Amino acid sequence: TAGAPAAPKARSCPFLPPDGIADIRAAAPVTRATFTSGHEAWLVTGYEQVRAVLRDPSFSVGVPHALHTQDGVVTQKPGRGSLLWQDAPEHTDDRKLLAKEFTVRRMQALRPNIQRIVDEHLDAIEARGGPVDLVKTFANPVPSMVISDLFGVPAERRAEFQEIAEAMMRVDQDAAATEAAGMRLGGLLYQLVQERRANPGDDLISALITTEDPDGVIDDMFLMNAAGTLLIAAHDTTACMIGLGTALLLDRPDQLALLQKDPSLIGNAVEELLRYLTIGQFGAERVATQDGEIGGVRIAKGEQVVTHLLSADFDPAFVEDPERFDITRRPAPHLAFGFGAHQCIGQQLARIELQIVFGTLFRRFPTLRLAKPVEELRFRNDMVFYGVHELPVTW
Ligand code: HEM
Ligand SMILES: CC(C)(c1ccc(O)cc1)c1ccc(O)cc1
């Protein structure tokens, strides 16, 4: 046909973006391409233009196609309180309500909880010795357990929360509301909400229950949608970064050795891991709602746009020598958490989880190493979030 060329996806090097991106970004940071669905849309690859799209409040997240799926069909989505598919003014109002209780202060307060969760999972790995799959024993279970503490889940209920979260982790966030595992999570959340109403606590769900609700928006469905969305948005993504960050650090002993010599670099290292790895691999989707202009290219009403966060995090106009992994950079504002109104709401919590996971993993296991070469690893090449399927490690 006369379709624009396929958006680059192949990687000859598994810790770098797809090979084709650089040449496009440099010549044409706003261009057309054809995505997995067969549809064509704008492909924005340069840092500055990705930020211009994402900060413009007239783009909508209600898109006509699902470009990264085979059939392109946009499935049915959850309602108010789920955020990801809402637009203003409802998105603005619902996010501000959730953010009233889901505060950066509540996220910092979870530090000790996180440290305990991280330490228990490593004592079990330790008690039974190498080799082990880090993905299954550590990267998958830790982030949902963090969230279960966020939600006040008591210890007798954890095994069931973890099993259900794990089934959901295998499903894409876009498909949750129309999959079976979604129903099983719905039933758990309905029940969790009733328990908290009956027995309030210090946790997030208890606080939302009694938050100041002038417009009368908070009912059980809103709460289930918010909790559900927090869990699903936090679990797969943070698990992928744990597994993929671990693999990259294990494959860069020079950067690892810097961190072991000066552990106060943990902050900076986490920022460079996020930039370098930008796990949302295929690009975020928006649709224009009015005519506009990005990078001197006219964008029309109804046109879909894909902001390629990975490509933009490797743009040489953003940082010097982008293909170099260097944990001593001064953090610059990467796009691994997005930008603008829909930017990751859990950014601060995810940073804490990763700082604690990598601080502690390398402090307790300085001899950690791969039990198989990086070319035998199997990467998540076709998944929404990039990472490793398995990460066998020893010490
Ligand atoms: C505690 C963990 C996390 C929680 C609770 C969380 C929560 C969320 C939620 C609710 C949203 C939707 C926000 C909205 O539309 O208003 C979101 C967006 C996003 N999150 Fe997270 N997140 C977590 C961790 C992560 C991690 C580890 C990453 C990436 C490495 C990530 C990347 C994103 C990105 C890119 C977006 C924006 C998508 C877009 O605008 O199209 N998040 N996050
Ligand atoms: C599990 C969840 C409550 C849900 C919502 C609606 C639904 O029909 C089925 C399941 C859900 C899914 C996805 C999400 O982003 C928020 C909440």
Numbering used by the authors: 5 to 399
Task: Give the text the authors published on this PDB structure.
Cytochrome P450 monooxygenases (CYPs) constitute a superfamily of heme-containing enzymes that are widely distributed among all biological kingdoms; they catalyze the hydroxylation of a wide variety of substrate molecules. CYP105s are the only CYP family that have been conserved with representatives in every Streptomyces species thus far investigated. Finally, we verified that CYP105P2 is a bacterial flavone hydroxylase, with potential for use as a biocatalyst.
The structure of CYP105P2 from S. peucetius was determined at a resolution of 2.1 Å. It contains 15 α-helices and six β-strands. The putative active site of CYP105P2 is composed of a heme group and hydrophobic substrate-binding site. Although no exogenous ligands were added to the CYP105P2 protein during purification or crystallization, initial experimental maps indicated the presence of an unknown ligand near the active sites of both molecules in the asymmetric unit. A careful examination of the (Fo − Fc) difference density map following refinement indicated that there was a distinct electron density with a bent V-shape. The conformation of this density suggests that it could be interpreted as a biphenyl derivative, which was then fitted into this electron density map. A ligand resembling the biphenyl compound bisphenol A was unexpectedly found in the substrate-binding cavity; this ligand was probably incorporated during protein expression in E. coli. The bound ligand forms strong hydrophobic interactions with Pro82, Ala181, Met187, Leu189, Leu193, and Ile236 side-chains. Several hydrophobic residues (Pro82, Leu189, Leu193, and Ile236) in the hydrophobic ligand-binding cleft seem to be used invariantly to interact with various ligands.
